């Protein structure tokens, strides 16, 4: 069973595994994160909440006053989406916050009842998000890209080889905070541990511990494990634990108990170790020979005189041993340093660090951080303290803390932000663990080590910074001013708030113009993930490290979707099913497998979690609701693939498509396409433009419905019911009582938008799909967006291609194409181009918009109204005048000759420049619409007044319709209510409609519902009448323009741009090309049947590019149309329902191995013939990614198309009539016309505007700029002996004014003599050198 739209069009799905989890909402990241920013959740730390409580409540420095924060309210944004887009405004809502000033006493305790003043202050405007997940910035559609960055926490890296002919194995710990200066502990060549604070200079790490309050001996405790050394008589004993020896050649005869245990020289084995352990050894005899060379732990004083002898960390020698036993200390604490496990580390650090106490450590700290500033005691202390222990400066966040705590083996999740000293020491503990070999080195590149920052989290960040500046201002003002009289609203300015926010939104790297070439482009952009931004890398900063492809990317990022060139590796699309976890870490849903059998439960796992478990691929073959089919099965654990048995297998992939991003998922036979071309394929799909006529792709994946759904540019039914009214502008639907609210009325209204301008200048038009009186379900596709068919993505159009070489028209990926394409108007773009005419005010005099245009052809005057505005609907051309404008001139430079002629002929010069609004070069289309914004100062223009009056009556009509449509629903409902328990249709029908408020029947449910709906009329009426007023405050208001600008007119040009040679076209497989020639229909080869070809693609583009999937598409594409052929035939031949039903069903059930079984049977005759009509155009199939249609099943279908199974047909050359000697591959492939139009790519310049400083020609089509003839080109000329051409380029063509003008005149005169001058650039050079006080003179001969 299926919905009404699916019943209308099925696409045959060749999917072998059943997709258990439904595709997640693709835009969720954006929606949900932005939601978190504003989410009214008092206890929940999200956005506003978190920011406020972090600094708030702000207590006075004097201590006797305080500012408290209660709660905030978001006003409903003053400007709607449409309105902000119209005026070029940023779309936002007011934030208002309830605050309290509370005042204490000095003298009387701190009696908190002195002055209490409280109220709502305005805290600025917050840019709001659209339904689409997008944002209105300066009246343009932007998206904030997700940002990957290295998570706060601990990173333990190895510099492998690096530096040195040794190649010293040198490790390092990097400490990364969310907020604060950085810590680095690294290994010097000779193994001494150096600290870099804020990675600045290398000091001994011990100095840091000194600052931390540690004594020499305290550090040696927490680092080194002491060894107990007794002196008895003349001999020496150690308290020795059996395990300590472990792997140690003997230097003496080690007499324990009685018997010789360790031979002098014999390597101690594990036997010797357990023997002694079980014997119960405390003390062992040892030579005075052993201790010379060890180290002394504590600082043992000689008690007698008081004199120190062994110091904290001193080398032991023969004579000092005598002194110690002589001082009378029975118990000596020599050190444990064998190397091996516990090496010479902390010992060595202490020696290189001549600094001693806390204070000198703080001094050297301060002197590295601020070298040259005098070490005042409190300054040094405050520096170090504030570096790591300042709450405000230093926040690790739950993020930092959680990862930090996971690396150092802590059960505890959430930390106190500031660096606790345990943490610090633990850090060095774990580094020096790894240096012994205990820890593993971490990879920066681990997904579990990289966090993703969405909308709400970024917003919160920058908002918090606004609050920081607030604190500096606010807290400062809390102390000066007199407390009593002063109110809270005086203290608070919204400016820096809105500034920092709008900084983020507008100026940031991650906020970009949404790509709206097609719905795919938008959707893909929204979920793309960049490694750049604040706290992130740039182009040079990114090496192989992060760019390269990690195994962790599996099911999280598409490995195969990224911009080619220097952006590559940095920006990557989110894989399909993938989402962000709790901590912004990447996660993938996976199926449980309990004891061999595959359960139905899904769990989302992060990368870290993923490493643990053993996962089967989706591709693995599964026994029907039991176990795995093979005894030795295909899976991966701990990031590594191979064979496992059933019982060992813990989890499994949901479907193959979770591996790949949204873009990549749309490609049909990706399985047979090389990755290079795969990459290019996803990229091209992003640039495809919607044509006039949408065509559903012959070869889809099943994802084409989902894609469109989430794009959200299509209009979707949110209740279901029956369509009451259908308009190419309005779709109104009557809901079933099912979804009907007993509160409001049941009529749902969807106003569609036709032909609006996209950011790319592309087409955004909605077509209604269904018909009036059609019964439809919740989530049916009412109206399609641009590149969308009935539910499906209609990216481009599908043509009969023939793979063959032509007479060099298909040379190197070049394309041969039929005139029939233009005949059908396929691949014709609508481009809605925008132009703006600006009437500024100079002090030369205010410019004006009039029809008044000195020395213009009345051809150009004729199309203009009295206001000087182009007529609605007039078709014009490049150069033609649209909007008239006049500007203040000022002549009077009559060089002699001019005065003469002015006298003779008259023609009295009226001062005015030709400011009037010209159309762009070589461009021709129709004016689709015009807009007028007059500033408040100057009075209304004729044209402005009349069009603002047009818009007036527009609002009226639309609003009246609104009220009456919903009123019709209400009234209809009351009759269904009054007729159920009060049988009256005679009396009511013919009574007036508005006289039913006075009514009153049986008292229960009937009466309560009646009153619900009656109050809906009162509400609708007062609602609408102000709803009107609103548009009438907006339209009436003089429109707010930038300073200096009198008035402005926006003009929309509608160009119908026809396909031509030089336009850019591609398929989904990375095969691309330029149109070389459009051949008349006759020229193209034709079938035996007489059907002529559409496009002829070069087969030589295949083999070296290695995308073979396009061939698969071609074959399946012909058979899809072969289906359409036969069906179309039986439609023309009428026939019987039953027979059509038979053919169709046997078609769907074609695969022996198909998943999707559409047993038709139950379908009504209506639905049957309806379906047939739809598949008349060629049946749309679904090979899903990797889980697709095998070649044999394709061959099988080619029999059902009654066409050659090899998919090749013999072709007759339409020119000569000769057959081609062998058959060629023909069939339908899905083609697209790119956003790259030859129309734009054309540009040329002889003379135009030049550069200001260098006096060289400008750049770009925008300035009428010339191309740069670069040093490369120079080199070419030089290779030839071509001196004069070169000199041309250097002088007459560029900066030589006298030279270029003279040579121009010479050319007209037929001379072609050069006569060069001095290029201005060289003079630029001279003067800049002399500015540097460097004398450069050009010496005479």
């Amino acid at each position: 069973v299926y919905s009404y739209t699916e019943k209308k069009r099925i696409r045959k799905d060749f999917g072998k595994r059943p997709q258990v989890l439904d595709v997640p909402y693709l835009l969720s990241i954006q929606l949900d994160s932005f939601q978190k920013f504003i989410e009214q959740d008092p206890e929940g730390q999200y956005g506003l909440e978190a920011a406020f409580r972090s600094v708030f409540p702000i207590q006075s420095y004097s201590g006797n006053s305080e500012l408290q924060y209660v709660s905030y309210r978001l006003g409903e944004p003053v400007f709607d989406v449409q309105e902000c887009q119209i005026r070029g405004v940023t779309y936002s809502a007011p934030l208002r916050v309830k605050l309290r000033l509370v005042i204490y006493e000095r003298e009387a305790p701190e009696g908190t009842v002195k002055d209490i003043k409280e109220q709502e202050v305005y805290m600025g405007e917050i840019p709001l998000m659209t339904d689409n997940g997008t944002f209105v910035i300066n009246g343009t559609e932007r998206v904030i890209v997700s940002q990957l960055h290295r998570s706060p926490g601990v990173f333990f890296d190895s510099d492998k080889g690096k530096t040195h002919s040794s190649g010293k194995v040198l490790y390092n710990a990097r400490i990364i905070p969310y907020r604060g200066s950085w810590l680095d502990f690294e290994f010097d060549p000779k193994d001494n541990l150096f600290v870099r604070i804020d990675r600045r200079r290398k000091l001994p790490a011990t100095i840091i511990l000194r600052a931390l309050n540690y004594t020499t001996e305290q550090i040696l405790d927490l680092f080194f494990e002491k060894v107990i050394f007794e002196i008895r008589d003349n001999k020496l004993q150690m308290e020795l634990v059996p395990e300590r020896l472990r792997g140690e050649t003997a230097s003496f005869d080690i007499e324990a108990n009685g018997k010789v245990y360790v031979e002098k020289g014999r390597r101690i084995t594990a036997r010797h170790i357990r023997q002694l352990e079980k014997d119960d050894v405390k003390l062992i005899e040892v030579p005075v020979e052993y201790i010379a060379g060890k180290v002394v732990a504590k600082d043992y004083i000689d008690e007698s005189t008081g004199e120190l002898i062994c110091a904290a960390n001193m080398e032991l020698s023969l004579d000092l041993l005598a002194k110690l036993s002589q001082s009378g200390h029975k118990r000596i604490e020599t050190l444990f340093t064998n190397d091996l496990d516990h090496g010479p580390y902390i010992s060595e650090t202490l020696r290189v660090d001549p600094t001693n106490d806390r204070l000198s450590a703080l001094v050297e700290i301060y002197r590295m951080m601020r070298p040259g500033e005098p070490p005042t005691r409190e300054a040094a202390e405050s520096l170090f303290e504030n570096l790591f222990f300042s709450e405000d400066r230093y926040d690790l966040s739950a993020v930092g803390r959680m990862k930090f705590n996971r690396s150092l083996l802590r059960e505890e999740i959430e930390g106190s932000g500031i660096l606790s000293k345990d943490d610090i020491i633990d850090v060095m503990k774990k580094l020096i663990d790894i240096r012994n070999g205990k820890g593993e080195v971490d990879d920066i590149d681990h997904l579990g080590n990289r966090r993703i920052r969405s909308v709400g989290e970024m917003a919160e960040n920058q908002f918090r910074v606004g609050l920081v500046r607030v604190e500096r201002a606010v807290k400062e003002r809390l102390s000066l001013g007199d407390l009593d009289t002063l109110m809270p609203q005086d203290m608070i300015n919204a400016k820096p708030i809105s500034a920092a926010v709008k900084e983020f939104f507008g100026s940031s790297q991650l906020s970009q113009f949404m790509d709206q070439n097609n719905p795919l482009s938008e959707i893909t952009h929204k979920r793309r993930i960049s490694a750049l931004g604040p706290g992130g890398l740039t182009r040079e900063r990114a090496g192989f490290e992060v760019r390269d492809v990690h195994p962790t990317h599996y099911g999280r990022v598409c490995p195969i979707e990224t911009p080619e060139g220097p952006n590559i590796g940095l920006i990557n699309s989110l894989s399909v099913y993938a989402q962000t976890n709790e901590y912004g870490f990447l996660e993938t849903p996976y199926r449980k497998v309990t004891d061999g059998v595959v359960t139905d439960e899904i769990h989302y796992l992060s990368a870290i979690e993923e490493g643990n478990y053993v996962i089967a691929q989706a591709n693995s073959n599964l026994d029907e609701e039991g176990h795995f089919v093979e005894d030795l099965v295909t899976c991966r654990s701990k990031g590594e693939s191979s064979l496992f048995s059933r019982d060992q297998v813990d989890y499994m992939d949901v479907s193959t498509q979770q591996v790949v991003s949204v873009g990549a998922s749309l490609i049909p036979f990706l399985e047979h396409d090389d990755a290079n071309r795969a990459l290019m394929g996803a990229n091209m799909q992003r640039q495809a433009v919607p044509t006039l006529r949408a065509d559903k792709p012959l070869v889809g994946t099943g994802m084409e419905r989902a894609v469109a759904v989430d794009s959200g540019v299509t209009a979707v039914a949110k209740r279901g019911g029956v369509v009451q009214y259908v308009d190419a502008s309005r779709i109104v639907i009557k809901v079933n009582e099912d979804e009907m609210y007993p509160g409001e009325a049941g009529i749902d209204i969807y106003n569609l938008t036709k032909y609006t301008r996209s950011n790319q200048n592309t087409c955004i038009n909605q077509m209604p799909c269904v018909s009036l009186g059609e019964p439809v379900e919740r989530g049916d596709v009412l109206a399609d967006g641009p590149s969308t068919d009935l539910g499906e993505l209609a990216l481009g159009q599908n043509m009969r291609v023939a793979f063959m070489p032509w007479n060099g028209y298909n040379f190197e990926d070049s394309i041969l194409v039929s005139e029939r394409v233009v005949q059908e108007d396929r691949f014709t773009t609508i481009h809605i181009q925008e132009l703006a005419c600006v009437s500024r005010d100079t002090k030369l005099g205010p410019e004006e918009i009039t029809a008044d245009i000195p020395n213009v052809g009345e051809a150009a005057l004729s199309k203009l109204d009295e206001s000087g505005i182009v007529y609605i609907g007039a078709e014009v051309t490049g150069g033609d005048i649209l909007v008239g404008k006049v500007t203040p001139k000022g002549e009077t430079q009559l060089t002699p000759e001019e005065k003469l002629l002015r006298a003779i002929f008259g023609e009295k010069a009226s001062d005015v420049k030709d400011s009037s609004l010209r159309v762009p070069n070589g461009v021709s289309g129709t004016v689709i619409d015009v807009q007028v914004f007059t500033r408040d100062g100057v009075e209304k223009d004729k044209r402005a007044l009349e069009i603002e009056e047009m818009q007036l009556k527009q609002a009226k009509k639309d609003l009246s319709e609104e009220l009456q449509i919903l009123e019709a629903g209400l009234f209809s409902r009351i009759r269904a209510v009054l007729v159920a328990g009060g049988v009256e249709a005679e009396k009511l029908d013919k009574l007036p409609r508005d006289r039913w408020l006075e009514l009153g029947l049986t008292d229960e449910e009937k009466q309560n519902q009646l009153e619900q709906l009656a109050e809906q009329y009162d509400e609708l009426k007062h609602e609408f009448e102000k709803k009107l007023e609103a548009k009438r405050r907006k339209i009436t208001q003089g429109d707010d323009l930038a300073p200096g600008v009198l008035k402005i007119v926006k003009v929309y040009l509608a160009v119908k741009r026809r396909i031509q040679p030089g336009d850019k076209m591609a398929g989904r497989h990375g095969n691309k090309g330029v149109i070389s020639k459009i051949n008349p229909i006759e020229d193209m080869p034709y079938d035996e049947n007489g059907t002529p070809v559409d496009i002829v693609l070069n087969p030589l583009g295949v083999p070296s590019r290695m995308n073979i999937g396009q061939i698969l598409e071609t074959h399946l594409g012909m058979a899809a149309k072969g289906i359409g052929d036969k069906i179309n035939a039986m439609l023309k031949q009428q026939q019987e329902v039953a027979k059509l039903r038979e053919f169709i069903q046997r078609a769907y059930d074609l695969g022996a191995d198909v998943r999707q079984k559409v047993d038709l049977s139950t379908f009504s005759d209506e639905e049957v013939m309806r379906l047939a009509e739809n598949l008349r155009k060629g049946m749309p199939i679904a090979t899903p990614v990797f889980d697709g249609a095998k070649e044999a099943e394709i061959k099988e279908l080619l029999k059902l198309g009654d066409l050659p199974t090899s998919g090749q047909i013999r072709l007759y050359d339409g020119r000569t009539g000769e057959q081609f000697e062998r058959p060629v591959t023909v069939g339908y492939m899905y083609m697209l016309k790119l956003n790259h139009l030859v129309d734009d790519k054309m540009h040329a310049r002889s003379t135009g505007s030049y550069s200001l400083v260098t006096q060289q020609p400008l750049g770009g089509k925008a300035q009428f700029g010339g191309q740069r003839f670069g040093e490369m080109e120079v080199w070419a000329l030089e290779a030839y002996g071509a001196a004069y051409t070169l000199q041309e380029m250097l002088t007459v063509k560029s900066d030589d004014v006298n030279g270029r003008t003279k040579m121009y005149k010479n050319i007209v005169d037929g001379n072609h003599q050069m006569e060069p001058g001095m290029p201005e650039s060289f003079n630029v050079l001279l003067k800049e050198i002399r500015s540097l006080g460097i004398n450069i003179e050009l010496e005479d001969e």
Partner: protein, 50 residues
């Protein structure tokens, strides 16, 4: 890598195999970009000397 791709583009690779190939692909394209600026610069140096 020890185990190779036994299959061909004719058959179509799967999850695992296709994934495997991406490493080399991406590496290759990043090389074509970033490793060519070295060669360009080198060339310019030659030019200037000669």
């Amino acid at each position: 890598i020890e185990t190779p791709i036994t299959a061909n583009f004719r058959e179509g690779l799967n999850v695992l195999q296709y994934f495997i190939s991406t490493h080399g692909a991406r590496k290759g394209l990043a090389d074509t970009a970033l490793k060519t600026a070295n060669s360009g610069y080198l060339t310019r140096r030659l030019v200037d000397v000669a």
